[PDB]
Amino acid sequence: EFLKAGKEPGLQIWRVEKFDLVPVPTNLYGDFFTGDAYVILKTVQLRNGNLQYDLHYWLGNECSQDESGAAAIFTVQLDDYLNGRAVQHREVQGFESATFLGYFKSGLKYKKGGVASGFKHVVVVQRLFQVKGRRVVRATEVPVSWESFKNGDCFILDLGNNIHQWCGSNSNRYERLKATQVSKGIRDNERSGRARVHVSEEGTEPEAMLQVLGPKPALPAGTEKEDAANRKLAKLYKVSNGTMSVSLVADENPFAQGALKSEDCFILDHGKDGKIFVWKGKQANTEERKAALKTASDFITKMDYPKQTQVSVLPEGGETPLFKQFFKNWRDPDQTDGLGLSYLSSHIANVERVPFDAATLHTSTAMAAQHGMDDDGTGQKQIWRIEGSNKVPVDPATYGQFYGGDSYIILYNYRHGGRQGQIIYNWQGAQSTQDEVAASAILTAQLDEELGGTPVQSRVVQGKEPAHLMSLFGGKPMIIYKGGTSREGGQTAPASTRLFQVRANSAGATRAVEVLPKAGALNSNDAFVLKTPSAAYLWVGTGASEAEKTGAQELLRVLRAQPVQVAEGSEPDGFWEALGGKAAYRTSPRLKDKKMDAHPPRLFACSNKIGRFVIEEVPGELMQEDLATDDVMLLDTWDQVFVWVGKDSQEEEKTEALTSAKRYIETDPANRDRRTPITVVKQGFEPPSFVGWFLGWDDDYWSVDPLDRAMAELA
């Protein structure tokens, strides 16, 4: 007794019809009647072959309340049949989650009608659609009238055998490109290829358009997405009797993972940013868990949030990456073993995981993107130290050593594929004086412009160097001193006892970072170097590969001391108090390869609108076509925030590319490291570590205007 569901990886959509799940014809996936409710099941195949489920129910604007209730019931009971491991989403028309919208990049059509009105999914047609949206394109069915028209939008007059695409004079070219997807969708999916699509603009309306609409009058402009200030703060509550009562458990993110308890379920309030999460404990009694959706709705009312607020319901052990990022260092029991983690985001579920191999890196942009390496780091490079307001060439014998009282500029030529490119690294010491740091940024930008405005520009801060920057010095480790200086003047002497953290990247290169000499700075994944007046300790953590201890050894040579190698837990006590005694220090191993699972890359459009900084998430798989030439985009790799600069965006947004990327970082509710590197990228000159993230990158994509292409490519 059932309906054929669960199945294999794919997408299944039902329309809730008189308390019954009714399959939508697959060629109409994306069409929704505003008067009905739907249930949607996305099945994702994990890398280990297992199946992971996302259950969404979708409420139309004019949808019922009992019908909405049925959709809520079916979402709950389908999850019951899937043994409670799906994550549930309540999606309202016009404010659906990014995860939901990624299932349809032909757009969404919102149809007039519903079950009660007596309408089905199944030609004699006469509809009109208003198409709004850049990243998330939505086609709202509107009254067939000239009064529905706005000159800032594009409209689709559907006449069955003929489809008329009408684009207002005040509509930007990118919006017209997204509107062609809807017109093609109606042609290829509703009429299955047999329909003409006719494109036109203001003043070139065909006789058919004017025969149903009448003569065209003057038309008004259009009136109808994440302010950055609302992203940051969130709170965590514990529910009781979902007589619904909640108690504040944490008032400021990041939250302690220990705050979550298995016997209860919690609400993570992010409502000022438009979403709340319901985290179900695995030992919460089933009355509470089956009533999670009502508990979330009651919370929306109790806090006067908009009823369109996105609601997510997560089972314990299956929390999404966006949920876990609200927590200080979320660590699973499953973490270091296995193939993935609790969740695998739909938009990367089909990304082949390429291990690093320097010999073949020049042939795989995928490897470049996934490891943050544009090449093996063996090309021509000039290094400058900023003294006053000028670039001063650094002694080549000292290449790889960097002093915290300086800021440097690295010009590097990278080769990947059969193409050469340049990267300008702007390293800023944590103790470099503000004027020279600010001078290094200006001279960096100046160096870019004199080199054609084409080189990659990557702002780096001491202690958080990108993986590619470490690998620039042969087999020698990048050595990073705490607040010295290497200029001709004050060649000042070192401290008595120094400490050095020696970390390696996936390419084998290392960096030796001087840190405060205490036990709390130690780390079991890395080798360490402790130099005292007396001797020299070479400490090796239990997770330290041989590639780290070799790099730590070449550092003990430039320090001119012979080591005494000391394994973690096998420490002589002269070592133990040279730090001031023993204390706790980080031992949980790093994500290494699961970073992409725990922090998948995300694409955003940003904008410095008059007064407020706004970011819009780009849902679905990352596509080159999503990069509008008149936009400044952000590709949030975890270790590094790319900022792609469209060639046709305003000069204001172009020069603000650096700070807009940092306003994005500092407002991130994960409380991202403020030292996180930023990497400005120019349109048409993107590095492999950027393009390798994209399905189908065309090296000649922008040679022809994408809109001129689209009207040609069948329209």
Task: Give the strand pairing for 235-240 and 245-250.
Answer: antiparallel
CA distances (Å), origin 557, targets 201, 484, 541: 72, 19, 20
Closest CA to 542 of 512, 575, 507, 586: 586
Q: Which structure tokens are listed for 637? A: 């790799």
Q: Closer to Cl ion at the Cβ: 188 or 639?
A: 639
Nearest distance in Å: CB 28, Cl ion: 21
Residue 45: which H helix or E strand, with range?
A: strand 37-45
453 is in an annotated binding site: yes
**Is 319 marked within a binding site?**
no
User: Rounded to an integer, what distance in angstroms lies between the CA atom of residue 34 and that of residue 275?
Assistant: 22
Size of the site for Cl ion (CB under 5 A): 9
230 to each of 33, 219, 227, 664, how far by Cα in Å? Answer: 32, 35, 6, 12
- Pick 112 or 353: Cβ nearer Cl ion: 353
CB of 320 to Cl ion, least distance (A): 17
Phi and psi at residue 456, to the nearest 5°: -65, 140
Residue 530 CB, shortest distance to Cl ion, in Å, is 24
The residue among 328 and 419 lying less far from Cl ion, judged by its C-beta, is 419
In angstroms, give the least distance from the CB of 586 to Cl ion: 16
- The answer to whether 2 contacts Cl ion (rule: CB under 5 A) is yes
Residue 12 CB, nearest distance to Cl ion (Å)? 11
Residue placing its CB nearer to Cl ion in the complex, 307 or 419? 419
Q: Would you say 6 or 254 has its CB closer to Cl ion?
A: 6
Binding Cl ion by CB under 5 A: which of 188, 571, 639, 653?
Answer: 639
Residue from 107, 321, 421, 620 binding Cl ion (CB under 5 A): 421
Count of H helices and E strands in the chain? Answer: 17, 35
Residues 96-135 that bind Cl ion (CB under 5 A): none
Q: What are phi and psi of 317, to 5 degrees?
A: 85, 0
Contacts 24+ apart (CB under 8 A), 100-103: 100/40, 100/56, 100/58, 100/619, 101/136, 101/619, 101/620, 102/346, 102/347, 102/619, 102/620, 102/621, 103/11, 103/29, 103/40, 103/42, 103/346, 103/620
On whether 86 is known to bind a ligand per the annotation, the reply is: yes
639 assigned ligand-binding residue = no
576/697 with CB nearer Cl ion: 697
Q: Is residue 518 within 8 Å of residue 568, measured between CB atoms?
A: no
Q: 127 labelled as ligand-binding?
A: yes
We find the least distance from the C-beta atom of residue 22 to Cl ion, in angstroms, to be 12
Cis omega (within 30 of 0) for bond into 563: no
d(CA 148, CA 166): 12
Contact 489, 529 (CB under 8 A): no
End-to-end CA distance of the chain: 46
**By C-beta, is 219 or 344 nearer to Cl ion?**
344
Cα–Cα distance between 684 and 666 in angstroms, integer? 28
Nearest to 85 by CA among 317, 340, 320: 317
Contact yes or no for 509/552 (Cβ under 8 A): no
Site for Cl ion in 47-86 (CB under 5 A): none
**Of 158-166, 208-216, 566-574, 631-639: span binding Cl ion (CB under 5 A):** 631-639
Confirm whether residue 153 is marked as ligand binding. yes
Pairing of strands 527-531, 536-540: antiparallel
Nearest distance from C-beta of residue 473 to Cl ion, angstroms: 17
Compute the residue count for the chain.
715
Q: Write the CB contacts of 12 (distance below 8 Å, at least 6 apart in sequence).
A: 5, 23, 40, 41, 43
CA dist., res. 314 & res. 265, Å (int): 10
Does the footprint of Cl ion cover residue 352 (CB under 5 A)? Answer: no
Nearest approach, Cβ of 188 to Cl ion (angstroms)? 25
- Report, in Å, the least distance between residue 5 CB and Cl ion: 6
DSSP annotation of 490 reads: -
Q: Closer to Cl ion at the Cβ: 171 or 689?
A: 689
Query: Are residues 656 and 220 in contact, defined by beta-carbon separation less than 8 angstroms?
Result: no
**573 marked ligand binding residue:** no
Task: Name the residue among 194, 203, 200 with its Cα closest to residue 166.
Answer: 200
**Contact flags string 684-713 toward Cl ion, x per CB under 5 A:** ------------------------------
133 labelled ligand-binding:
yes
Among residues 282, 302, 328, 419, which is the contact residue for Cl ion, using CB under 5 A?
419
**Site string (21-40) toward Cl ion, x via CB under 5 A:** --------------------
| Single residue of 295, 342, 346, 370 touching Cl ion by CB under 5 A | 370
Residues 210-239 that bind Cl ion (CB under 5 A): none
The window from 294-302, 370-378, 543-551, 662-670 that contacts Cl ion (CB under 5 A) reads: 370-378
Q: Is 617 one of the annotated binding-site residues?
A: no
**Comparison of 367 and 578: residue with beta carbon closer to Cl ion:** 367
Q: How far apart are CA 634 and CA 640, in angstroms?
A: 10
- 504: helix, coil or strand? strand
What number of other Cβ atoms are within 10 A of residue 397's Cβ? 7
The CB-of-686 to Cl ion minimum distance in angstroms stands at 8
Interaction pattern, residues 464-503, with Cl ion; x per rule: CB under 5 A:
x---------------------------------------
Question: Residue 674 Cβ, how far from Cl ion at the closest point, in Å?
Answer: 13
290 versus 464: smaller Cβ distance to Cl ion: 464
Is residue 1 part of the contact set for Cl ion (CB under 5 A)?
yes
Spatial neighbors of 220 by CB under 8 A, at least 6 apart, are 150, 151
Q: Which is nearer to Cl ion, 242 or 601 (CB)?
A: 601
Question: Beta 265-270 vs 275-280: how paired, if at all?
Answer: antiparallel
Nearer to Cl ion, 421 or 563 (CB): 421
Q: Which is nearer to Cl ion, 168 or 421 (CB)?
A: 421
Please say which residue, 419 or 674, places its beta carbon nearer to Cl ion.
419
Stretch near Cl ion under the rule CB under 5 A, chosen from 297-305, 322-330, 456-464, 508-516: 456-464
686 is in an annotated binding site: no
Which of 50-58, 253-261, 369-377, 545-553 is the region at the interface with Cl ion (rule: CB under 5 A)?
Answer: 369-377
Region binding Cl ion by CB under 5 A among candidate stretches 2-10, 126-134, 177-185, 373-381: 2-10
Residue 436 φ then ψ, to 5°: -75, -35
Instruction: From 248, 238, 249, select the one nearest 278 (Cα to Cα).
Output: 238
288 is in an annotated binding site: yes
Binding site for Ca(2+): which residues? 35-36, 67, 79, 84, 86, 115, 152-153, 175, 263-264, 288, 405-406, 436, 448, 453, 455, 485, 525-526, 548, 630-631, 653
Binding site: which residues? 35-36, 67, 79, 84, 86, 105-112, 115, 127-135, 152-153, 175, 263-264, 288, 405-406, 436, 448, 453, 455, 485, 525-526, 548, 630-631, 653
- Which residues of the chain form contacts with Cl ion (CB under 5 A)? 1-3, 353, 370, 419, 421, 464, 639
